[PDB]
């Protein structure tokens, strides 16, 4: 089992326990890289209202690792939780936060009724737009009035509101293409043994075979090579 010897820990606490989340219309996108990602903490945590994975099973996230992980962090209304998924439509899915229908990753959300609610109108969503958003996009002549509407609308979040309570949602987008990994789980690497049949794991890529010295000129950005069968 071989992983890059990274001792840095991934700053998930700075995403999930952040002082403030951004508005859904202007969601934050934090890059996670060059670190050890312990996903058992997030998965085991009972504080989450939902932890739905569309990409991979949540318990495999510690064996598997990624070229990068992005954390999309924003506040939504509780009834809008259902819109944050591949294949969904709706005011948020179409005008504020669009996911690829082939999205790989996990959507994690929890109630913030005891944290953000006041009325707290500091969270805006897009009420009007001319067309739908592209995946991961971050979006009457000067005179507003009838049929001339201001595009953003706040959420009146109050402690007395479940579907109308504020929710904090973090979407973890995983790029798992066979390329150099920078975000890997809490796995202890061992020594590599050559010219013998072994069960190997290279950055989450597994198989059985004999590892030998080679003269293959991999380019600086090439982590893996492939056969005709697309096998390693």
């Amino acid at each position: 089992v071989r992983f890059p010897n990274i001792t840095n820990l991934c700053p998930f606490g700075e995403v999930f326990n952040a002082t403030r989340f951004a508005s859904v219309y202007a969601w934050n996108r934090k890059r996670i890289s060059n670190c050890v990602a312990d996903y058992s903490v997030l998965y085991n945590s009972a504080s989450f209202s939902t932890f739905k994975c569309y990409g991979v099973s949540p318990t495999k996230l510690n064996d598997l690792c990624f070229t990068n992980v992005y954390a999309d962090s924003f506040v939504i209304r509780g009834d809008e939780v259902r819109q944050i998924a591949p294949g969904q439509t709706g005011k948020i899915a179409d005008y504020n936060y669009k996911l690829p229908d082939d999205f790989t990753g996990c959507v994690i959300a929890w109630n913030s009724n005891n944290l953000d609610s006041k009325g707290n109108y500091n969270y805006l969503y897009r009420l009007f737009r001319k067309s739908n958003l592209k995946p991961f996009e971050r979006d009457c002549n000067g005179v507003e009035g009838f049929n001339c509407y201001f595009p953003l609308q706040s959420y009146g979040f109050q402690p007395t509101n479940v579907g109308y309570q504020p929710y904090r949602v973090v979407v973890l987008s995983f790029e798992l293409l066979h390329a150099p990994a920078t975000v890997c789980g809490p796995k202890k690497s061992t020594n590599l043994v050559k010219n013998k049949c072994v069960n190997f794991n290279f950055n989450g890529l597994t198989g059985t075979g004999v590892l030998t010295e080679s003269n293959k000129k991999f380019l600086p950005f090439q982590q893996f090579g492939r056969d005709i069968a697309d096998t390693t």
Partner: antibody
Framework: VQLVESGGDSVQPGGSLRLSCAAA????????MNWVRQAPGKGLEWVAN????????YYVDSVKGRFTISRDNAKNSLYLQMNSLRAEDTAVYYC?????????????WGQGTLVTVS | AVVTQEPSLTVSPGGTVTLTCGSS?????????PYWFQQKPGQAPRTLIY???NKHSWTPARFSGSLLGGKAALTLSGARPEDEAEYYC??????????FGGGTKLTVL
């Protein structure tokens, strides 16, 4: 969006005064143009309006026959002329831009021009 | 051409407000396309609500252009000191000859 009204001054009762409003930053001939007046220490009084193309004019009954509105769409401005101006009519006149459904009430407001009659 | 309002309301910081307005005849409905304005000392009136319930971009979302029992209203979900102002209502009638109410003064305790 800016509405700049003027023409307010110290005038004598029984005379007349022409007030005006210039539009800036937006199209004049696409909106209704309102006038509202406020006597110091009092609430707002609706005074007059005019339709987008000038084909129709509206007045509060209390100024009917005394107030006239005309406009020049090439200058992006309108004029309110009040005749037989009363001593009691001391108020700030405001220009307001009505972009709502019916055009009867303004959404954008100017700063106001003070008319004092003595 | 008669419109009336509650002369004044007092609200504690964070408390709600129910400013009211209505005509002497019939009832207030969306057909009156009601407007509400806010005026702070030294300032021109600023429209907050238009055409019954549409809120302007410059209006804090704490304000809500709701209707009551045949009356117009401007309510607050939690008043702040910054909201001390006189408020005015305006209703349409048989045509574009609107009538203002007496004004409702809102202060914060």
């Amino acid at each position: 969006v800016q509405l700049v009204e003027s023409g307010g001054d110290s005038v004598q009762p029984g005379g007349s005064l022409r007030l005006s409003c210039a539009a800036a930053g937006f199209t004049f001939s696409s909106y209704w143009m309102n006038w509202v007046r406020q006597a110091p220490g009092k609430g707002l009084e609706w005074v007059a309006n005019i339709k987008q193309d000038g084909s129709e004019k509206y007045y509060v009954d209390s100024v009917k026959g005394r107030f006239t509105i005309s406009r020049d769409n090439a200058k992006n401005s309108l004029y309110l002329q009040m005749n037989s101006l009363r001593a009691e009519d001391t108020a700030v006149y405001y220009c307001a831009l009505s972009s709502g459904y019916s055009g009867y009430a303004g959404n954008y407001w100017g700063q106001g021009t003070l008319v004092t009659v003595s | 051409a008669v419109v009336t309002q509650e002369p004044s309301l007092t609200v504690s910081p964070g408390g709600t407000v129910t400013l009211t307005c209505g005509s002497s005849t019939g009832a207030v409905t969306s057909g009156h396309y009601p407007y509400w304005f806010q005026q702070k000392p030294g300032q021109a009136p600023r429209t907050l609500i238009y055409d019954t319930s549409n809120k302007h971009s410059w209006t804090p979302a704490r304000f809500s252009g709701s209707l009551l029992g045949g009356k117009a209203a401007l309510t607050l979900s939690g008043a702040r000191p910054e909201d001390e102002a006189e408020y005015y209502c305006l209703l349409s009638y048989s045509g574009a000859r609107g009538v203002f109410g007496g004004g409702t003064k809102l202060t914060v305790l």
